[PDB]
Structures are given as C-alpha cells and as structure tokens.
C-alpha cells in the first residue's frame, strides 16, 4: 500500500562464477611465477546461518590449476638447449661393472659422433643411458623420441620442486570454503567461510599414490562422482599419513659436452662405486592398517556382507601402470603390485623396486619431450602418502589408477568455490524520496 522501492548498494549476495584467479606465495619456477606475497593472516570470515552448494567435479578452479601448470612448465623450458643434434645413430653395449640385483642389462654405454663449436668438425663422445630412453634399431640405437619430436634439455638451474601455491580472488570475487569434515564432494555445506586466498597447495605430480597433500580429520573420506559407475576414479583421502622412503642408490656424476657456440649437453657420466636398483620402503604394518581403514569405509557403499579385493592394475603406459614419482631431479616408475594385492574378508616392510627414466613426455603429450639432466650424487626422498587414486572392475575388485592430472588437484580444491559478488539490489521500504 505505502511501500516504495529503496535501492541498496553493498548488499552481501553472490552468484556462482567463473573468473580468473591469481597465485601468491610464502630459481624455482613457481617462486618466479607467484611474485605476489601472501598475507600471513588467513583472514578467514565465518558465515553464520548459510548452506552453500558445492561440486568438486564441476569446479573450474581445477581447470585453471591444470592450465597454469602446463603453461608454466612449458614456459620454463623455452630458453634452453635443444638436443636435436643428438638424434644420430648410437653404438650401445651393456654396461659391465659391479652390477647387482637385476640391474644387469638395464644400463647401456653409448658412443656417438655429434657436432662441435666448429661447423667443420664432429666429435666422438659417450654417455650412459637407461634402457627406457633408448630404442634398438639393429649395437645400433636411436633415442626414443627422435621420430616424433625435438627433445629439449631442461635448463639445469631451474627448480621444479613443488612449493605451496595459494590461489587468490581478484577484486569483486570471493572464495567460499567448506569446513564440513565429512564433506561428500557434492551438495550443501554448512559452516562455510569466506577467504581471500586458498591454503597452500603443493603442485606435486604423481599417479596411483598422492603425495604431500592434506589429511582428513577423521577416518577416510571416499569421494567419487557416481561410485556405481566404475568408470570414474575414486579419490581416497586418509586421516593418517603413510611415510615412504625412496632412493636412487648409485653415486652419479656428469659429463658436460659442448655441442655448439654457447650450447651444451649434460650427459650421464660414469657411475662411481657399485650399481644397485632404485627403490621405495613402506612400513608394512602401517600400510596394512591403512588399507583396513579404507576398506572399512569403502564397504559403506557396497555392503558389509561383501568382499573387497585389490589388484595390481593394468595399462599400456608406465605413467599409469607404475607409480609415477618425481624425486629430486629424477623420474621414478615404482612397482606397487605387492602393495595392492590383498583380499579383505570379514618391524617389517615392503620394498618397491623403481625404474628410472630420463627422457620424459609429460602431461600425456606426444609432440613434446624433455631431457632430464642427470643428478650428481645419491638421491633420497621421504614423502607422505596422503591419498590414493583407485578404480573399480559377487566380489568387488579395486586397482590403482589416475594419470589425468586433474584428479590430483581435485583432492585439494574440492573444498573451494568461486563466487561473484553482486552488491546492488532493491527491496520495498516505507521511505519515500523527498
């Protein structure tokens, strides 16, 4: 009867939105990239009496994190030496040395003729290679990727060590965070707070096992888009970490070869001391308890009258059939088949042998290749297993999987949503102009 339109500005409302996020932090590629410092104060604002709907599989923050890592990774390799001049026939024989375990035949001693600083001359050089880097054509060999792409040597001073990255909203935007300790992955969430920046997320790249992520507050949280449709990956988050001790035991050196006028190649040099197999150690008791925790929670979706079995998985690609792990400066491909072979019906340790690969084709791309410079000395890493990526095949059987990469970030970004602030609006009041 006597109500009039009053216009208000600064109204605390929003809409779901897709915008551009920027990073912040605290010769690393991400330290160079994330030039914006974070505020030591999280500035987290609790929102009382709200029920926000979240969906981790529809979250565009995932696409940006993926896009940003690909872009950064590639940009950092642009101003580097190409190894196109190394795509020549190699003459390779097996390394004869004090070689133990089953490493005999794993390494080869390759000699070849490459370019020099002088256009009129070639030089005879040699280097060591792992079997996984070299393809036989006969003692005649080629590097594996010379038939599809140029191989770029990564710049030796560039560090790809993951450091925490914080994603921050631009002005006019905000990030809502779900604090429900039991959050499903989809649906309404109570105890939602607003933040400016996310917690730091380390851009760790791996398959099968997820290393150095966040832990669940209680039990195991099992999240998948459908569960029923076994084609989807299951992301399993643990409330306890499992420590894994990894090493490359050989004492390596480098042989620096000049290949042109301001360009050089780092060859794997002679091995100092005996040759041993690379491997990872997982405490057995901890691992068996961890699976028991996962299986108990997994049963909630299948029944408490069933059987849960694990498989060693399968595939046509080392990136997914083995545990892809980046330790220090070298890429490991570890055998987890003895880690996932139990069947669950209701001091000791397991050693996982690991293979080392030097020519890397990341992000499942074909047209690009990177040569990982060899690392001097002996390599040791200790990592935290914080979660697993599993797939499913009357007994149910589960196996290690992943490799899409996006799934390695969904596990950290599932609690965040980006919204757009819409500060202008109207409502009826008793107040009239003039």
């Amino acid at each position: 009867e006597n109500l009039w339109v009053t216009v208000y500005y600064g109204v605390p409302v929003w809409k779901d939105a897709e915008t551009t996020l920027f990073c912040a932090s605290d010769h690393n590629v991400w330290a160079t990239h994330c030039c914006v410092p974070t505020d030591p104060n999280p500035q987290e604002i609790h929102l009382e009496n709200v029920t926000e709907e979240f969906n981790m599989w529809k979250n565009n923050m995932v696409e940006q994190m993926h896009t940003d890592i690909i872009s950064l990774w590639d940009q950092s390799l642009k101003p580097c030496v190409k190894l196109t001049p190394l795509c020549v026939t190699l003459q390779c024989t097996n390394v004869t040395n004090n070689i133990t375990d089953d490493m005999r035949g794993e390494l080869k001693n390759c000699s070849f003729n490459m370019t020099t600083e002088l256009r009129d001359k070639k030089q005879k050089v040699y280097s060591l290679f792992y079997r996984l880097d070299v393809v036989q054509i006969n003692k005649e060999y080629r590097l594996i990727n010379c038939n599809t792409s140029a191989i770029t040597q990564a710049c030796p001073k560039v560090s790809f060590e993951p450091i925490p990255i914080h994603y921050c909203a631009p002005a006019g935007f905000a990030i809502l965070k779900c604090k429900d300790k039991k959050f499903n992955g989809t649906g309404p969430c109570t105890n939602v707070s607003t933040v400016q920046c996310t917690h730091g997320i380390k851009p760790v790249v791996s398959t099968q096992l997820l290393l150095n992520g966040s832990l669940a507050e209680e039990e195991v949280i099992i999240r998948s888009e459908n569960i029923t449709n076994n084609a989807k990956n299951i992301l399993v988050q643990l409330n306890e970490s499992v420590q894994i001790n990894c090493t490359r035991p050989n004492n390596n050196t480098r042989k620096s070869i000049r290949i042109g006028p301001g360009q050089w190649f780092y060859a794997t040099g002679d091995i100092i001391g005996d040759i041993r197999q690379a491997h990872c150690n997982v405490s057995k008791a901890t691992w068996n308890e961890t699976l028991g925790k996962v299986v108990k929670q997994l049963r909630k979706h299948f029944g408490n009258n069933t059987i849960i079995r694990f498989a060693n998985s399968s595939g046509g690609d080392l990136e997914v059939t083995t545990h892809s792990f980046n330790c220090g400066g070298e890429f490991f491909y570890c055998n987890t088949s003895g880690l996932f072979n139990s069947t669950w019906i209701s001091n000791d340790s397991i050693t996982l042998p690991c293979r080392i690969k030097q020519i890397i084709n990341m992000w499942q791309r074909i047209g690009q290749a990177m040569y990982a410079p060899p690392i001097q000395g002996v390599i040791r890493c200790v990592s935290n297993i914080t979660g697993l990526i599993l797939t499913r095949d009357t007994t149910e059987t589960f196996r290690p999987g992943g490799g899409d990469m996006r799934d390695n970030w969904r596990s950290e970004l599932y609690k965040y949503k980006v919204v757009k602030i819409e500060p202008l609006g109207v409502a009826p009041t008793r107040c009239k102009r003039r």
Binding site: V11, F22, I45, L47, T194, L424, G425
Partner: protein, 119 residues
C-alpha cells in the same frame, strides 16, 4: 567480504560500507584483464546509481511505488525473517523492470527541477 551474509536483511544493511569498500580495493596480460574487469564492474554499478539519482549513497529512496506483483509479502517477513540471498532469488525475474522504472523516474524528476529553477 561477505561477513553479514546469512543475517537478516535488516541486520545486513549495517555493513554496506564494508562490502562496498572491498569491491574496488582487492603472460601478464592475464592480470591486466582481471584488473580491467574489476574496474569495469565497479563503474557499471556506479553509473546505475548515478543515473537513478542515488549517486553518493549506499541507501537511497526513490519515488517508484512497490508493485505487489513483484512481491506480496508484508514489510515484516521481508526485513526480519529473510536474508538478502533469499530476497534476491524471490524477485530475480523483476530486476530489469525495476531498473527501467527507476531510470524513467529520474528523468522526470530532473526535468521538473529545471523548470522549478526557472521561476
């Protein structure tokens, strides 16, 4: 900052300056695009408030009557039992109507002011 969200409409209006301030304050082409957009969004809202005769105010009263068509709820049951998110959804299909009416009103008002000053 959305700290008052979830509180009722009559409570939330107490913080309009908090939300307003934080709207503007907060390869590289990526950041310029983000910054330019933030400026453009800010200015679009300021232009609307200005064109409706609400320049410089967070709360402005107009001479456009409330249509029971848009909402037939009483003053009570809007300001005390609802938050802004709920309100925004209930009348989300009339926003463009109200905005058009507000612009027409301001044009008429300015014309009348000019003719009054003429005396």
């Amino acid at each position: 900052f959305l700290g008052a969200a979830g509180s009722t409409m009559g409570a939330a209006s107490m913080t309009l300056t908090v939300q307003a301030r934080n709207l503007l304050s907060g390869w590289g082409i990526k950041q310029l695009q983000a910054r330019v957009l933030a400026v453009e969004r800010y200015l679009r809202d300021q232009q609307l408030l200005g064109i409706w005769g609400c320049s410089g105010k967070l709360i402005c009263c107009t001479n456009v009557p409330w249509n029971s068509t848009w909402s037939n709820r009483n003053l009570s049951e809007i300001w005390d039992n609802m938050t802004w998110l709920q309100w925004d959804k209930e009348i989300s299909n009339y926003t463009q109507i109200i905005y058009g009416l507000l612009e027409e009103s301001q044009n008429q008002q300015e014309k009348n002011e000019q003719d009054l000053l003429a005396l």
